[PDB]
Each structure stands twice: as structure tokens, then as C-alpha cells.
């Protein structure tokens, strides 16, 4: 996966992020709180919104299709997601990814890029 500068983590320290994660997980327990950010140097559209609350049983594949619409991509342009710095399987649910890969602040972080392989 790409080496990420997470703007959410640059702006907000762990204590602040954990408080927000705590709150949102109690308010919306069946939704996964996800922070989505673009890989540095990718020339894809930057998402206008980075914070999403996603149904737990939505698949990665279905999430690809929703994000694709929001970043104005064609069928010709490539889009790849990275969770825990690896590409998730398309049938995996957002709930399963959260269970396995949420950070200590209680968010799931997902990076996107037009490239699939990074040094």
C-alpha cells in the first residue's frame, strides 16, 4: 500500500480522535465509521468528504461502486482501495474489515489510488 499522510490524524491527536470514535460508535452502532483519503501523488479527484458511516454488511465491491461515483471516474480509470496497507477482497464486508482492522481511535481507515503497487 501507499505511504499515507492522513489529514485527519495530522489535524487531530489520538485523544481527540478516540473521543469522536467513541461518540459515533455509540450513536450509530450498526454503521462503520470510515476515514477515506487519497494516496499522495495520485491524480484522482480528492473526495470532498472523508468521513462516512457505512452499513456493516455493505461489501468492499459495493463500496468501490459508491466511491467511484463520488470521485467522477470512468470505467477506463483504475481505482484501488487499501485497508491495513493491503488490497481487500471484493466480497469482504465493511463490518468484517472494521472487526479486523479498526484503529485504536475506533475508525477504519481506507486509502484509495489509481495505482495498485507501491514501494
Amino acid at each position: 500500500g501507499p505511504h499515507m499522510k492522513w489529514a485527519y490524524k495530522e489535524e487531530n491527536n489520538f485523544e481527540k480522535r478516540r473521543a469522536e470514535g467513541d461518540k459515533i460508535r455509540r450513536k450509530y452502532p450498526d454503521r462503520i465509521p470510515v476515514i477515506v483519503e487519497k494516496a499522495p501523488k495520485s491524480k484522482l479527484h480528492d473526495l470532498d468528504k472523508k468521513k462516512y458511516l457505512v452499513p456493516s454488511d455493505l461489501t468492499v465491491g459495493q463500496f468501490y461502486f459508491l466511491i467511484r461515483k463520488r470521485i467522477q471516474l470512468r470505467p477506463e480509470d483504475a481505482l484501488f482501495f487499501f485497508v491495513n496497507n493491503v488490497i481487500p477482497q471484493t466480497m469482504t464486508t465493511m463490518g468484517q474489515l472494521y472487526q479486523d482492522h479498526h484503529e485504536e481511535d475506533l475508525f477504519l481507515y481506507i486509502a484509495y489510488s489509481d495505482e495498485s503497487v507501491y514501494g
Binding site: 468521513k51 462516512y52 458511516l53 457505512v54
Partner: peptide
């Protein structure tokens, strides 16, 4: 604020 999908 969070966006609901």
C-alpha cells in the same frame, strides 16, 4: 459531519 452511505 459524517456522510451516510
Amino acid at each position: 459531519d459524517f456522510t451516510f452511505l
